[PDB]
Amino acid sequence: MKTIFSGIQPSGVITIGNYIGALRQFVELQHEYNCYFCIVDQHAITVWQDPHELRQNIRRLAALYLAVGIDPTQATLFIQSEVPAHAQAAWMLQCIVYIGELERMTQFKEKSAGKEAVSAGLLTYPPLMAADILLYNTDIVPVGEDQKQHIELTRDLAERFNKRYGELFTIPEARIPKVGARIMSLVDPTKKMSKSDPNPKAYITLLDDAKTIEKKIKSAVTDSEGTIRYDKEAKPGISNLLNIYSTLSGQSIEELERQYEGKGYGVFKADLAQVVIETLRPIQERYHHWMESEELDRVLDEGAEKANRVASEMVRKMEQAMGLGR
Amino acid sequence: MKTIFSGIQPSGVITIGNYIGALRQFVELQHEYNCYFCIVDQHAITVWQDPHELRQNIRRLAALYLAVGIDPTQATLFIQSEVPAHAQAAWMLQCIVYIGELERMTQFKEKSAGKEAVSAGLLTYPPLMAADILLYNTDIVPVGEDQKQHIELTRDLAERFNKRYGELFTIPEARIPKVGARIMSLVDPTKKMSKSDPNPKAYITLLDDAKTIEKKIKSAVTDSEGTIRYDKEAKPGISNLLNIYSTLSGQSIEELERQYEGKGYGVFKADLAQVVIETLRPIQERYHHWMESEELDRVLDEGAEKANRVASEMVRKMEQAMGLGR
Numbered sequence: 001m002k003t004i005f006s007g008i009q010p011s012g013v014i015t016i017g018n019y020i021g022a023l024r025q026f027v028e029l030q031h032e033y034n035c036y037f038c039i040v041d042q043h044a045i046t047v048w049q050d051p052h053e054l055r056q057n058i059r060r061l062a063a064l065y066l067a068v069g070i071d072p073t074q075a076t077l078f079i080q081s082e083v084p085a086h087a088q089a090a091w092m093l094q095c096i097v098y099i100g101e102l103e104r105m106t107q108f109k110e111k112s113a114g115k116e117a118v119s120a121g122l123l124t125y126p127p128l129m130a131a132d133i134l135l136y137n138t139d140i141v142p143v144g145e146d147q148k149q150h151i152e153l154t155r156d157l158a159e160r161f162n163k164r165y166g167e168l169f170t171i172p173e174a175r176i177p178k179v180g181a182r183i184m185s186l187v188d189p190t191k192k193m194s195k196s197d198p199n200p201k202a203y204i205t206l207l208d209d210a211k212t213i214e215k216k217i218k219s220a221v222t223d224s225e226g227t228i229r230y231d232k233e234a235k236p237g238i239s240n241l242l243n244i245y246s247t248l249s250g251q252s253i254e255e256l257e258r259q260y261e262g263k264g265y266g267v268f269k270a271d272l273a274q275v276v277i278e279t280l281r282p283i284q285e286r287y288h289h290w291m292e293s294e295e296l297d298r299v300l301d302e303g304a305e306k307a308n309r310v311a312s313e314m315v316r317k318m319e320q321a322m323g324l325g326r
Numbered sequence: 327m328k329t330i331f332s333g334i335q336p337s338g339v340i341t342i343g344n345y346i347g348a349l350r351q352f353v354e355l356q357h358e359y360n361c362y363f364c365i366v367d368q369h370a371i372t373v374w375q376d377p378h379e380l381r382q383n384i385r386r387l388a389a390l391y392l393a394v395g396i397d398p399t400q401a402t403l404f405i406q407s408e409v410p411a412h413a414q415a416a417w418m419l420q421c422i423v424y425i426g427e428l429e430r431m432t433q434f435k436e437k438s439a440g441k442e443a444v445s446a447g448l449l450t451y452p453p454l455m456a457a458d459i460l461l462y463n464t465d466i467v468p469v470g471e472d473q474k475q476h477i478e479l480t481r482d483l484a485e486r487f488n489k490r491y492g493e494l495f496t497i498p499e500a501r502i503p504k505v506g507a508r509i510m511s512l513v514d515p516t517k518k519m520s521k522s523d524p525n526p527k528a529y530i531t532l533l534d535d536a537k538t539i540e541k542k543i544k545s546a547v548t549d550s551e552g553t554i555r556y557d558k559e560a561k562p563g564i565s566n567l568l569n570i571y572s573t574l575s576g577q578s579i580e581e582l583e584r585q586y587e588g589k590g591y592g593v594f595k596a597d598l599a600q601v602v603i604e605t606l607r608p609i610q611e612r613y614h615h616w617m618e619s620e621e622l623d624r625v626l627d628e629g630a631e632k633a634n635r636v637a638s639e640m641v642r643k644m645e646q647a648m649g650l651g652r
């Protein structure tokens with residue numbers, strides 16, 4: 001039985017991009033693999049987070065993990081900061097990675113483009129993520145396309161540690177879905193949808209109500225050609241909407257192209273909004289059930305205890321390999 | 327009663343520079359302050375350390391801490407990596423510091439000058455050091471001159487956290503001794519003496535035997551003027567040797583200048599070597615007593631338990647202020 005690890009930042013409320021690219025597949029993989037699913041709050045604070053919003057987004061993410069169908073008896077669900085081994089292993093891997101490898105990361109370059117002043121944690125984001133994965137001898141890392149480069153670096157760091165000190169880490173492999181690996185922003189179809197986008201109109205969170213979802217889908221940027229067909233280069237907006245429609249409804253893109261022959265973008269958008277609303281309706285109902293109850297904290301308590309047992313043992317082996325401590 | 331924190335890297339065997347600039351004063355301050363003295367093995371691995379040498383240098387440093395007279399019932403002596411709070415607080419402070427502040431650090435610039443490839447841990451050395459200090463509500467940090475800049479940054483990070491989130495950290499002050507704050511290398515009197523210098527002749531470790539100390543002092547670079555007088559600009563070699571002689575023997579520099587009027591560098595160096603040997607002789611005897619015994623590990627066990635109690639509580643307050651966890 002292979003091991004899976006994957007994490008989601010409580011930098012906001014997760015989007016249909018997070019769902020389609022990652023979380024939706026978590027629900028299937030929990031039955032086939034030994035699964036660790038993490039709320040990576042230490043990654044979230046690599047940029048400014050209001051403390052009250054962060055505390056709440058951590059609970060919201062935990063509730064949405066379970067609301068979409070993750071069974072806490074089949075997968076280990078826990079908060080990153082409640083397992084100290086992640087910070088401990090992050091430091092050791094920070095001493096393995098070179099500054100040039102971190103500065104070349106695409107995520108760092110895009111996230112620091114606003115400039116002014118960028119935290120060191122943003123630069124050292126990858127070694128913490130590498131620690132997340134390597135601590136549990138992870139075989140498979142299910143992610144969207146945006147995390148492929150970080151997993152490539154994680155493999156490099158595992159190989160470097162293994163050959164500098166001794167064989168210890170499993171070399172992880174990314175698992176990126178064939179469909180929906182990069183949901184695009186509704187207001188800029190050339191940028192990926194992000195839950196921390198300064199525009200709320202760029203994303204659909206799993207907690208958006210019907211009126212909000214209708215507004216954001218109908219406001220999504222398109223061309224003016226009027227034909228509903230998939231073509232990323234010429235029609236990136238319509239192409240993104242068709243991809244969301246297809247993967248949420250179960251209709252193929254060609255089937256959707258035929259369905260909307262001779263129809264305008266207006267009815268296409270209105271229909272897609274209702275497809276999204278109906279998808280989110282049972283998720284939101286179970287979400288409110290998890291946010292109301294003490295059982296959410298008990299799930300998190302037990303998840304952290306289990307992750308701590310595995311991760312702290314790996315840290316002991318990492319320290320012994322490097323010569324730290326006694 | 328004010329609190330003191332100071333740490334020494336097990337990157338090697340500590341030198342007379344480490345002793346004169348820091349450790350010697352530890353022995354006095356332990357009776358006047360609430361003291362934490364640390365073996366910072368996580369700082370040591372910011373550059374390559376052979377695991378076997380690192381494991382041994384950690385024990386050697388612990389033994390030399392106690393051999394010079396640190397009383398484990400008057401001060402808390404512990405290993406950095408055995409208190410996870412240091413890595414945890416280091417991550418949070420990494421999210422407070424800006425990359426530009428780390429790149430401007432003098433230590434980073436000098437240590438990365440060899441170039442090729444520099445670990446990220448070398449860049450993020452300061453936020454871990456800031457964590458070391460701030461975790462124990464430290465008032466005073468006794469160090470040599472080389473650590474002044476790191477403590478200035480630590481104060482900046484404490485103030486930034488305090489005003490971004492809420493008053494939590496004590497603002498520490500450096501305590502740099504009037505005499506001996508920067509012992510210089512014996513082979514390059516314009517560089518500070520360093521325990522990890524690629525030349526062994528640059529430093530005198532506390533464990534150097536008599537023949538070795540004689541060799542290194544007699545090989546120390548001087549001018550050819552022949553006069554024994556203190557003048558850093560014209561005679562940096564002789565000036566460094568006079569400073570070591572003065573602070574170890576209790577004679578003032580002027581008293582030493584008068585004593586060696588009309589004498590050559592040869593007898594001056596030979597005499598200084600014996601002053602150093604006699605200084606180290608009782609230290610080395612008690613060192614061998616600590617390395618032989620189980621009581622060294624018990625001291626370290628109790629030190630880590632006490633430091634963990636204080637540091638883990640501060641991490642809980644740091645997490646609560648930032649919104650991490652629950």
Ligand SMILES: Nc1ncnc2c1ncn2[C@@H]1O[C@H](COP(=O)(O)OP(=O)(O)OP(=O)(O)O)[C@@H](O)[C@@H]1O
Pocket residue numbers: 006007008009010011015017018019020021022142143144145146147180181182183184192193194195196197203
């Ligand atoms: N636009 C996207 N399309 C598909 N998957 C995505 C997308 N964005 C994130 N993911 C996925 O969500 C998972 C968690 O990553 P993360 O927490 O950092 O999302 P985010 O960047 O903060 O939110 P988002 O990108 O949607 O705006 C990843 O496994 C994977 O990258």
Ligand SMILES: Nc1ncnc2c1ncn2[C@@H]1O[C@H](COP(=O)(O)OP(=O)(O)OP(=O)(O)O)[C@@H](O)[C@@H]1O
Pocket residue numbers: 332333334335336337341343344345346347348468469470471472473506507508509510518519520521522523529
């Ligand atoms: N040349 C020196 N003169 C005086 N104090 C020193 C000197 N070098 C280090 N120190 C002091 O030793 C303490 C521990 O610092 P550290 O472990 O990093 O020493 P080091 O750089 O590795 O060894 P060294 O500088 O002697 O070659 C510090 O509080 C303080 O900087």
Ligand SMILES: OCCc1c[nH]c2ccccc12
Pocket residue numbers: 005006007008009040043128129132133141142143147
């Ligand atoms: O950076 C993407 C979020 C994340 C943090 N740690 C991880 C480990 C595995 C998959 C995703 C993450």
Ligand SMILES: OCCc1c[nH]c2ccccc12
Pocket residue numbers: 331332333334335366369454455458459467468469473
């Ligand atoms: O960098 C100098 C060694 C060191 C690491 N952490 C510290 C905290 C206080 C004084 C010195 C150190």
